[PDB]
Amino acid sequence: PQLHNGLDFSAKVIQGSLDSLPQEVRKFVEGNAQLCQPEYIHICDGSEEEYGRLLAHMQEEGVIRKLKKYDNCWLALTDPRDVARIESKTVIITQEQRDTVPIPKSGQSQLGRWMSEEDFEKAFNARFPGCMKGRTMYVIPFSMGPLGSPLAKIGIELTDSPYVVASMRIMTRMGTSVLEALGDGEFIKCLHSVGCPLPLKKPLVNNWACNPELTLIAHLPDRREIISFGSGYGGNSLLGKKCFALRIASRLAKEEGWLAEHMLILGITNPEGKKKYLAAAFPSACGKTNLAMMNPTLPGWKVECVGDDIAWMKFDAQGNLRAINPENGFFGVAPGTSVKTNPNAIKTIQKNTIFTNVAETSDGGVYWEGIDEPLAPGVTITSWKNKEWRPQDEEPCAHPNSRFCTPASQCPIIDPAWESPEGVPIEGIIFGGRRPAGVPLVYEALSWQHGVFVGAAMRSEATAAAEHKGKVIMHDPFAMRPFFGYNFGKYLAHWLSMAHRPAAKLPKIFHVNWFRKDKNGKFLWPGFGENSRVLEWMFGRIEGEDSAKLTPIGYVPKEDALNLKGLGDVNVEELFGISKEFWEKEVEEIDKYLEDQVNADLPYEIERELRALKQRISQM
Numbered sequence: 137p138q139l140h141n142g143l144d145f146s147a148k149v150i151q152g153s154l155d156s157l158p159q160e161v162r163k164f165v166e167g168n169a170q171l172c173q174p175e176y177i178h179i180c181d182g183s184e185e186e187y188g189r190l191l192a193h194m195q196e197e198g199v200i201r202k203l204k205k206y207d208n209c210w211l212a213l214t215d216p217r218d219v220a221r222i223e224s225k226t227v228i229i230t231q232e233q234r235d236t237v238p239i240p241k242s243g244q245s246q247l248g249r250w251m252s253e254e255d256f257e258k259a260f261n262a263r264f265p266g267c268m269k270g271r272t273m274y275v276i277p278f279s280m281g282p283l284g285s286p287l288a289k290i291g292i293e294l295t296d297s298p299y300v301v302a303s304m305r306i307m308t309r310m311g312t313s314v315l316e317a318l319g320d321g322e323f324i325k326c327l328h329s330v331g332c333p334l335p336l337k338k339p340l341v342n343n344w345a346c347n348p349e350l351t352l353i354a355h356l357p358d359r360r361e362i363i364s365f366g367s368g369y370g371g372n373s374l375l376g377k378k379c380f381a382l383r384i385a386s387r388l389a390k391e392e393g394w395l396a397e398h399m400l401i402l403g404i405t406n407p408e409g410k411k412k413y414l415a416a417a418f419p420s421a422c423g424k425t426n427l428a429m430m431n432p433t434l435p436g437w438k439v440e441c442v443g444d445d446i447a448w449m450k451f452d453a454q455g456n457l458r459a460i461n462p463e464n465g466f467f468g469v470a471p472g473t474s475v476k477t478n479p480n481a482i483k484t485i486q487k488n489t490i491f492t493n494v495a496e497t498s499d500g501g502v503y504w505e506g507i508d509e510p511l512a513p514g515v516t517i518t519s520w521k522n523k524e525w526r527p528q529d530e531e532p533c534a535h536p537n538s539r540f541c542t543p544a545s546q547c548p549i550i551d552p553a554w555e556s557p558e559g560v561p562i563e564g565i566i567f568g569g570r571r572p573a574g575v576p577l578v579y580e581a582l583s584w585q586h587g588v589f590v591g592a593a594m595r596s597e598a599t600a601a602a603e604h605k606g607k608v609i610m611h612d613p614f615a616m617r618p619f620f621g622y623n624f625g626k627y628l629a630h631w632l633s634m635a636h637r638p639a640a641k642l643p644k645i646f647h648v649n650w651f652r653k654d655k656n657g658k659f660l661w662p663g664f665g666e667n668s669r670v671l672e673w674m675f676g677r678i679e680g681e682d683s684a685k686l687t688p689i690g691y692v693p694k695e696d697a698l699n700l701k702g703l704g705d706v707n708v709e710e711l712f713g714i715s716k717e718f719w720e721k722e723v724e725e726i727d728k729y730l731e732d733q734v735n736a737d738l739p740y741e742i743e744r745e746l747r748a749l750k751q752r753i754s755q756m
């Protein structure tokens with residue numbers, strides 16, 4: 137009801153009907169329309185017609201440019217203050233801090249950023265009232281996972297950014313079919329604003345609306361709400377991806393008995409016609425997308441891609457660990473992608489793809505560092521800063537975290553089961569990061585509990601995916617440090633608890649290091665497609681081959697067990713060398729980190745594996 141006409145927003149709906157929405161969706165839309173005061177409400181239907189109209193609208197406003205060299209591809213350039221996910225402005229709100237992060241022993245927690253409800257209420261009220269004045273509020277109904285999969289979950293994103301709408305169309309299943317599937321069921325409430333109500337108070341850089349000073353990405357798992365303000369970029373604004381599918385989902389997974397993880401999923405088939413599925417957790421900028429889409433160098437081997445970033449997994453009634461990729465496309469780092477580092481990506485991204493912050497060539501193409509591809513005489517480059525750029529300038533032509541956003545269905549090696557609602561059965565889990573020294577090319581964990589410890593102990597040299605810079609070695613347990621939805625100690629206990637399930641077929645757990653360097657600072661391992669030789673070894677180990685030797689850190693390949701035919705140059709001694717001096721320092725750093733950062737919530741089984749590793753190293 138109403139005594140006037142300040143609550144019914146029907147007269148402002150320019151696509152769809154508030155009457156046709158499920159009751160709780162209408163309330164969520166109308167209540168935030170009352171708060172944010174948009175000029176128009178557009179209820180997305182997911183259609184090709186809508187998508188083409190939206191792209192035309194952004195092209196007219198100067199938000200995106202058409203890349204005339206390719207088929208339906210587009211370029212966006214951002215404000216240089218809004219170029220990446222921002223860990224330092226991302227918070228989780230729970231009544232008790234301990235539900236979000238373990239209470240550290242001495243230091244500040246690195247495992248999450250808690251904010252009280254009372255503080256968030258102040259932050260929210262400082263930001264959202266009136267924030268969409270003069271803009272359109274888009275209503276995005278989307279499904280994470282195949283529509284109707286048992287592991288699928290539905291979200292509603294409200295946003296004032298047409299770029300978010302277009303990107304969500306690629307990255308999720310979006311439109312009217314989701315609403316019909318949702319009915320009166322529950323959904324995750326996602327609210328986003330770039331934070332730039334009209335008339336503009338600050339001028340817009342690169343026609344990219346954002347509010348860097350007030351950027352805040354907040355999660356409220358008890359209310360099933362995600363609330364994000366001030367950034368239009370990637371994981372800050374595409375709320376289905378990191379905010380929903382890792383942070384909110386990892387908490388739901390804890391409650392419901394499954395797992396939501398920063399893992400690629402791939403299927404690999406050997407020359408004897410056998411196929412296995414593996415998942416791999418690497419931190420951002422450590423090569424998940426290269427491995428998920430690998431072109432193997434070994435003949436008779438085939439790799440197919442199920443997903444490159446997020447896995448949802450659950451033991452089924454038979455005890456198999458079944459995984460789905462909840463995304464609908466790939467949001468991959470552009471620079472360094474080339475025919476030699478990721479040829480299956482090159483094939484995927486030449487149609488129906490949105491690029492952000494890469495360089496544009498004068499003939500309507502795309503450029504970036506490491507593309508490894510010469511340009512024709514006369515072809516010039518406009519950098520991501522919208523500036524004439526020569527290979528002689530110090531500037532990169534593309535931002536280091538520039539991205540492509542591409543439909544998964546177009547990948548030439550997309551797995552035939554990538555949308556199966558029952559998921560694929562996972563037989564191995566791989567961990568790894570960037571370790572220039574000390575850590576060998578591959579090893580296999582001694583047991584489930586040791587495997588969980590290996591994940592907990594992950595470390596990786598700092599790169600350029602968040603706001604971290606330099607060549608520091610930081611901890612990133614399970615590749616989830618920016619994405620835990622709840623207390624990491626309880627997360628470890630949850631992983632450990634999977635070994636108590638009836639008829640659970642626990643996968644083997646491996647750790648890889650593509651990044652070991654010799655004294656020259658040169659990579660010991662060629663990597664990329666040659667990593668198929670490491671996968672072959674893992675495949676044999678899952679089948680039970682006697683191809684491992686025991687070391688203090690776990691099992692490594694026996695002499696001659698790795699197929700090195702071709703690269704006869706490889707320094708095997710240094711690639712698999714294990715130094716007592718290095719590993720004594722390594723266990724000490726893990727011990728200090730686990731004691732401070734997990735403290736009273738560290739499971740005894742993890743502390744036991746640390747003691748066991750310390751003892752095996754002392755006996756070297």
Ligand SMILES: Nc1nc2c(ncn2[C@@H]2O[C@H](COP(=O)(O)OP(=O)(O)OP(=O)(O)O)[C@@H](O)[C@H]2O)c(=O)[nH]1
Pocket residue numbers: 418419420421422423424425426427445467468469471472477601650651659662663664667
């Ligand atoms: N030396 C070496 N580098 C690799 C290998 N595979 C990938 N890389 C490097 O990894 C970087 C690309 O990784 P990203 O796409 O940024 O990592 P990602 O895991 O997909 O990251 P997110 O999408 O952010 O989760 C490039 O610098 C590559 O050169 C490899 O096998 N060997």
Ligand SMILES: O=C(O)C(=O)CS(=O)(=O)O
Pocket residue numbers: 220221369370371372377378419420421445467601
């Ligand atoms: O940071 C990551 O791991 C990503 O995959 C990119 S974003 O979705 O977080 O922007």
Ligand SMILES: [Mn+2]
Pocket residue numbers: 424425444445467468469
């Ligand atoms: Mn990636």
Ligand SMILES: [Mn+2]
Pocket residue numbers: 398420445
């Ligand atoms: Mn990622």
Ligand SMILES: [Mn+2]
Pocket residue numbers: 635
């Ligand atoms: Mn046990």
